[PDB]
């Protein structure tokens, strides 16, 4: 099993395994379904107003409680200081 | 002894083998079902794991030219997420506990049982040397009128 | 209330006097300029970065060397056939058409075969009509041989690696045509006047041949090329290797006689006239009749008739001093120490003398 | 910044931070007397 | 602006306390202003959530230097700790968590966090760390199987 | 990660780096901050036209 | 987001105009789509210590602005919008994609990333992970008692000062 999709021009040898190609799933009409609604149907409503500006980064849990908002802020600040995924830097001012 | 330092350092990097990325991290749904002593046990476990991971990360930063980027770096993020979820569960439990406690304490304070000179307080009936009379009227009447009457 | 900026880039752009700082110190010597190297980072690290699994699976989809050799030889033959012939004028030498479209197929053939071919040599063999015919015939023969019976050098390397993990027959027809066309290219390069390049080409051309006669001929040719290149040591080495292969060569081949000639001439250039006369005497006692040896013996005797009249012999401390052939002059014109520019007194060489390396 | 220039790591050379052949010249030529130790003086005097 | 922009060896900690600092402290303590404040007794007691969590789930980053103990029998291994720890803190840590009881002496020495520039030239400094040089009775070593 | 996705082909959904669009400014606003409600905005987006 | 791997999408503008392809990859945070055999270029891999320079054809990400889906039944360009619809076997409501012309719902294929595999040395079994050992009545007893003791001690000290 090769863990990546082959390039354009490669030929899969005999007895090899490849992640399956993305195929379209099932197909069903809308007339058969009885409960059908649109995404964001209300355009003149007043509840979709932002409580925080769009440039504010969201630092909160998935439920909506801010119990550990400062903990998440500290985690993000530590990530900004030294990201764990940081590769091999090119700068001449290397940390070590 | 030496096993302490052997667990401070990594094992796959010690045997010159590629360390694999683990499956997942502790979720809040699991940590809610876990008990307090169990929570602190797994907390110390994650703490030791994070110490080993940070030692390996610092070693790779010291040798970034001899050795490339640290293999499987998402482990530190998984450990931090697990620790944050532990803290979240403990904070929820402490919030419930302190809510119950402040309710009980305000009830006690309303009862008025505390007294710095150690001993039971005097009874309320021996103190309340006054009485109240409730009279029903069919219409509003001035307070000074009721007083003078 | 003033600021001090030692050396900053001017209005048009950063010059070398500041790029030196940028490459050594890491940033400009003022400190007010922030080091920004995103472009070179993208050009080097982002390009050389490859994931481990893809890097490991790359070696599975490399092209087939046999098919690559066949296609490269076909394309190179097509290109050298399409290449036009030089029209000879009268009164002035016509400029040969530059080989613009020939560098890519020749480069592919070189990187597929493991040998380097001179562009000057190719241009010269294309200018020469008969050499062009020899080269075309040999290239077509090599094409047919690699298309019918595979690649003998590749099969030999495969068998060598197989026996290493777990003898050598005579040279095949493909290797024979290959060494033939390489000798043709080397002859054209010698006619053009690049003796060092000709010797370097023949040095790798000898690797394809395994029969003693072909090896002796290649050794004689390398001896002559090194003699013209003034590398007397290698010239003598190959010239005597020819006579070493002599006992196993066919009687009709004179490659060993030419090797004797090259060895004697290398000795004469090293100014050991006694050794050169002894070598040509041995060569004559071996092949009593040979013009390449007889002419050289006559020349050496004409020199030896005047040798005792000047100093009674050649000196000992003055040997290998007089520069005779113009090839070493042309090489020293480039590799020579300049007047005040690059010499033992300039500091860039003085520090190389001072420090170990 | 000579340490960061030479001894530090760069995309062309390895780190010389822990390297005796590059750090040995940092030691002083003329030896110097040791500095006074206040903790040692306290543990030696043991005021009463 | 009151933001300190120097990330060198002489970085100074600002003693002036800002209103936002107190606000954030109170908010992380008891969810200000949604939840009612706990009474002064619980606030100043050992049961207050931050102290309780710091005592029952301690958070101390102890990193071992691989060069000091890798493939060499060393009697002075070094560790990196947060600045809020001391010699007694570290020896209790190693004795209770990792079981390293035989600790002769710990040599303390602070150290400014590592500073570096990325490709675009932004100055990002790593968190500060305190260097400790613990002394043992027996020399230890972790071999690296080559 | 751009080089890695170009060489592999794996589909990435979330950004590999957390982007703080405030450059450290979001930590200056108090935590309980929330935008107030503005009635009768002088805009046309609330109509939701799709033909002009 | 409407473009998910598995759909047939036609290129409307730019290079490769009028060509249909299958979405191979979706770079969401960059708003790019890697389509099959469309906008393929030669990517190079530098020679390492053991391998030579290797150049190979690979598709490159295509922006989303210049691509439009293809109706599965009509086989033509159709505008597609997000539509919330409840499932027949699951009461939950999922977001499908519906065309205006034909009215055909399109499901969202899951990620199904099996490449990541954990190590059995540092992984706890799901049985021990899911077993519960927490009791609300017993554990909250000690906490509430400690809180009460602390608050009462402080209140007694305040009464002492008063």
């Amino acid at each position: 099993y090769m863990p990546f999709r082959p390039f354009h021009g490669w030929t899969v040898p005999n007895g090899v395994r490849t992640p399956p190609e993305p195929t379209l799933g099932p197909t069903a009409k809308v007339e058969d379904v009885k409960d059908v609604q649109l995404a964001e149907p209300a355009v003149g409503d007043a509840s979709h107003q932002r409580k925080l500006p769009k440039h504010f980064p969201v630092v909160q849990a998935s439920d909506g409680s801010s119990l550990l908002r400062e903990e998440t802020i500290a985690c993000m600040e530590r990530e900004r200081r030294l990201p764990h995924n940081m590769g091999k830097l090119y700068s001449y001012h290397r940390p070590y | 002894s030496a096993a302490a330092f052997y667990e401070f350092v990594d094992n796959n990097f010690l045997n010159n083998k590629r360390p694999p990325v683990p499956g997942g991290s502790w979720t809040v749904e699991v940590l809610r079902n876990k008990s307090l002593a169990d929570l602190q046990h797994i907390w110390f476990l994650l703490l030791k794991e994070r110490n080993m991971l940070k030692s390996m990360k610092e070693h790779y930063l010291r040798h970034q030219e001899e050795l490339g980027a640290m293999p499987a770096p998402s482990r530190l993020k998984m450990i931090d997420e697990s620790m944050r979820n532990i803290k979240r569960v403990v904070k929820e439990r402490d919030e419930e506990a302190t809510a119950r406690a402040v309710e009980i304490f305000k009830e006690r304070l309303k009862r008025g049982i505390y007294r710095y000179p150690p001993g039971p307080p005097p009874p309320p009936g021996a103190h309340d040397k006054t009485s109240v009379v409730k009279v029903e009227l069919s219409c509003y009447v001035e307070e000074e009128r009721l007083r003078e009457l | 209330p003033t600021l001090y900026l030692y050396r900053f880039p001017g209005p048009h752009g950063p010059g070398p006097y500041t790029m030196k700082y940028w490459w050594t110190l890491g940033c400009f010597p003022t400190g007010m300029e922030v080091p920004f190297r995103l472009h070179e980072f993208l050009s080097t690290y982002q390009q050389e970065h490859v994931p481990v699994e893809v890097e490991e699976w790359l070696r599975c989809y490399i092209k087939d060397p046999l098919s690559e050799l066949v296609n490269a030889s076909n394309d190179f033959f097509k290109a050298v056939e399409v290449y036009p012939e030089v029209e000879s004028a009268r009164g002035y030498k016509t400029l040969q058409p530059s080989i613009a479209p020939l560098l890519v197929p020749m480069k592919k053939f070189e990187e597929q075969l493991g040998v380097k071919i001179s562009p000057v040599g190719l241009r010269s063999v294309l200018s020469n009509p008969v050499l062009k015919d020899r080269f075309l015939d040999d290239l077509f023969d090599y094409k047919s041989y690699v298309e019918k019976g595979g690649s003998t050098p590749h099969r030999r390397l495969a068998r060598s690696r197989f026996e290493g993990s777990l003898p050598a027959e005579t040279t095949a027809d493909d290797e024979r045509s290959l060494i033939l066309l390489l000798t043709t290219i080397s002859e054209g390069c010698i006619n053009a006047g690049n003796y060092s390049d000709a010797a370097s080409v023949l040095a790798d051309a000898l690797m394809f041949c395994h029969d003693p006669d072909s090896q002796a001929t290649t050794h004689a040719n390398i001896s002559f090329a090194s003699l013209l290149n003034a590398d007397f040591k290698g010239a003598e080495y190959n010239g005597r290797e020819a006579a070493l292969l002599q006992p196993q060569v066919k009687p009709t081949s004179t490659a060993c006689a030419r090797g004797y000639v090259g060895w004697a001439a290398a000795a004469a250039y090293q100014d050991d006239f006694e050794k050169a006369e002894a070598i040509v005497k041995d060569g004559l006692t071996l092949y009593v009749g040979n013009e390449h040896l007889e002419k050289l013996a006559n020349k050496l005797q004409a020199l030896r008739e005047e040798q005792p009249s000047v100093y009674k012999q050649v000196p000992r401390s003055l040997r290998e001093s007089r520069s005779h052939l113009p090839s070493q002059q042309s090489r020293g014109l480039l590799s020579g120490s300049g007047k005040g520019f690059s010499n033992e007194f300039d500091w860039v060489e003085f520090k190389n003398k001072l420090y170990p390396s | 910044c000579s340490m960061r220039v030479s001894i530090y790591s760069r995309p062309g050379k390895v780190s010389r931070l822990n390297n005796a052949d590059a750090t040995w010249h940092n030691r002083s030529r003329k030896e110097k007397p040791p500095d006074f130790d206040p903790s040692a003086f306290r543990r030696r005097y043991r005021d009463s | 602006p009151p933001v300190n922009d120097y990330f060198g060896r002489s970085r100074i900690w600002n003693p002036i306390a800002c209103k936002l600092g107190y606000v954030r402290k109170k908010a992380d303590e008891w969810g200000w202003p949604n939840k009612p404040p706990p009474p002064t007794g619980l606030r100043y007691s050992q049961e207050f959530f931050p102290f309780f969590f710091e005592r029952y789930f301690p958070d101390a980053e102890v990193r071992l230097l691989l060069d000091s103990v890798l493939n060499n029998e060393t009697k002075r291994p070094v560790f990196q700790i947060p600045c809020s720890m001391s010699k007694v803190e570290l020896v209790n840590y190693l004795k209770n968590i990792y079981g390293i009881d035989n600790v002769v002496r710990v040599e303390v020495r602070n150290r400014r966090g590592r500073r570096y520039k990325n490709e675009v030239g932004e100055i990002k400094m790593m968190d500060d760390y305190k260097v400790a040089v613990v002394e043992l009775d027996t020399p230890v070593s972790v071999e690296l199987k080559q | 990660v751009d080089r890695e996705v170009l060489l592999t082909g794996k589909s990435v959904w979330e950004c590999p780096i957390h982007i703080d669009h405030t450059c450290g400014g979001s930590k200056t606003v108090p935590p309980h901050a929330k935008k107030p409600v503005r009635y009768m905005d002088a805009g046309i987006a609330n109509v939701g036209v799709t033909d002009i | 987001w409407i473009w998910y791997p598995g759909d047939i999408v036609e290129v409307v503008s730019g290079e490769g105009i009028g060509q249909r392809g299958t979405i191979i990859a979706v770079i969401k945070y960059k708003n790019e789509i890697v389509v099959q055999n469309i906008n393929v270029q030669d990517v190079v891999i530098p020679a390492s210590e053991s391998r030579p320079e290797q150049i190979v054809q690979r598709e490159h990400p295509i922006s989303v602005t210049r691509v439009r889906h293809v109706d599965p039944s009509t086989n033509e360009i159709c505008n597609i919008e997000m539509v919330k619809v409840r499932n027949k076997e699951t009461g939950e409501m999922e977001e499908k994609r519906m065309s205006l012309e034909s009215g055909i719902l399109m499901s969202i294929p899951p990620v199904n990333d099996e490449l990541e595999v954990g190590d059995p040395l540092k992984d706890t079994p799901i049985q021990d992970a899911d077993e519960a050992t927490y009791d609300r009545e017993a554990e909250q007893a000690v906490l509430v008692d400690k809180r009460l003791e602390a608050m009462e001690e402080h209140f007694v000290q305040s009464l002492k000062q008063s």
Side-chain angles (χ1 to χ4, degrees), chain G:
Chain G
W1 198 262
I2 311 182
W3 297 260
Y4 283 139
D7 307 327
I8 295 184
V9 176
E10 179 178 347
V11 176
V12 291
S13 66
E15 61 200 66
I17 174 179
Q19 300 178 357
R20 301 184 181 182
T22 305
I23 292 186
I24 293 301
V26 169
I27 307 180
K28 184 178 180 180
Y29 80 104
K30 287 186 175 182
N31 299 333
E32 308 196 61
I33 302 172
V34 184
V35 197
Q36 193 182 13
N37 61 86
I38 298 181
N39 191 24
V40 48
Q41 297 173 342
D42 294 358
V43 294
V44 75
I45 296 174
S48 178
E49 186 178 331
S50 59
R51 69 175 185 273
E53 193 92 12
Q54 185 169 176
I55 179 173
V56 68
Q57 295 210 350
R58 184 55 164 179
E59 296 83 14
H60 283 269
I62 292 186
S63 179
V64 190
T65 58
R66 63 159 183 167
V67 292
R68 297 193 179 279
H69 298 273
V70 177
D71 193 297
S73 64
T74 315
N75 300 337
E76 296 177 345
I77 299 96
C78 61
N79 303 337
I80 297 191
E81 300 77 19
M82 193 66 58
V83 162
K84 294 183 177 180
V85 50
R86 283 203 166 193
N87 301 325
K88 308 307 173 183
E89 46 80 23
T90 297
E92 276 62 62
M93 44 186 301
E94 63 175 3
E95 291 72 41
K96 285 186 174 181
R97 317 181 302 260
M98 184 201 65
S99 60
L100 293 179
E101 168 174 79
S102 59
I104 289 185
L105 300 181
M106 293 183 176
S107 301
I108 296 181
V111 279
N112 282 10
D113 41 355
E114 193 41 73
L115 305 179
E116 199 173 32
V117 178
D119 56 329
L121 198 149
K122 287 182 171 58
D123 287 0
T124 173
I126 312 180
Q127 305 83 38
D128 292 333
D130 296 356
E131 61 176 344
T133 173
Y134 167 72
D135 40 356
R136 183 178 182 179
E137 292 77 11
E139 289 203 6
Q140 288 191 169
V142 190
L143 293 173
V144 170
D145 294 336
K146 291 182 177 180
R147 308 298 193 269
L148 260 299
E149 292 319 297
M151 296 179 296
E152 290 163 352
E153 285 295 331
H154 171 61
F155 195 79
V156 169
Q157 287 293 147
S158 181
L159 283 172
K160 171 174 183 178
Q161 279 113 28
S162 300

Side-chain angles (χ1 to χ4, degrees), chain B residues 21 30 34-35 96 108 114, chain G residues 117 128-129 131 139-140 152:
Chain B
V21 44
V30 170
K34 293 309 169 184
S35 179
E96 300 182 4
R108 297 270 196 85
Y114 306 107
Chain G
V117 178
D128 292 333
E131 61 176 344
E139 289 203 6
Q140 288 191 169
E152 290 163 352

Side-chain angles (χ1 to χ4, degrees), chain B residues 14 43 50-51 55 63 94 98, chain E residues 42 49 58-59 64 67 98:
Chain B
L14 201 62
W43 171 270
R50 187 264 297 271
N51 277 16
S55 296
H63 304 67
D94 292 324
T98 184
Chain E
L42 184 48
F49 167 69
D59 204 8
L64 173 139
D67 297 3
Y98 294 91

Side-chain angles (χ1 to χ4, degrees), chain C residues 199-315:
Chain C
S200 180
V201 168
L202 281 176
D204 203 2
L206 87 92
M207 191 61 179
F208 299 106
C209 62
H210 306 277
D211 213 68
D213 67 337
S214 59
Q215 285 200 352
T217 305
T218 52
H219 273 282
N221 298 333
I222 295 182
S223 65
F224 288 166
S226 174
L227 193 71
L228 299 183
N229 193 33
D231 196 2
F232 305 148
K233 174 166 160 293
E236 157 184 6
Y237 169 78
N238 297 269
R240 65 182 173 185
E241 288 295 334
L244 298 188
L245 298 179
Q246 152 69 25
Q248 297 82 344
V249 84
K250 296 182 178 181
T252 177
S253 299
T254 56
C256 320
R258 295 205 310 270
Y260 271 109
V261 174
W263 188 11
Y269 279 148
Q270 288 287 350
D271 300 76
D272 204 358
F273 286 86
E274 307 178 15
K275 175 189 294 181
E277 289 183 346
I279 292 170
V280 73
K281 161 192 172 184
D282 299 5
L284 289 181
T285 55
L286 188 52
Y287 301 91
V288 186
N290 190 271
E291 303 307 89
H292 296 297
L293 278 169
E294 189 271 327
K295 190 184 189 185
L296 180 54
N298 293 15
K299 186 63 174 58
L300 291 179
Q301 185 60 32
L303 293 179
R304 197 72 178 185
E305 287 173 10
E306 307 176 4
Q307 286 302 138
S309 180
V310 282
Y311 201 69
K312 300 291 175 299
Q313 199 45 51
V314 289

Side-chain angles (χ1 to χ4, degrees), chain A residues 63 67 71 84 87 96, chain B residues 57-58 64 73 87-88 91:
Chain A
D63 57 355
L67 299 180
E71 188 78 4
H84 64 288
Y96 275 138
Chain B
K57 181 68 172 181
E58 200 65 29
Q64 197 172 9
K87 186 173 184 178
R88 160 74 176 277
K91 191 172 187 179

Side-chain angles (χ1 to χ4, degrees), chain B residues 68-80:
Chain B
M70 173 182 173
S74 60
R75 307 181 290 184
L76 297 85
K77 182 177 61 60
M78 295 178 182
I79 293 298
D80 199 311

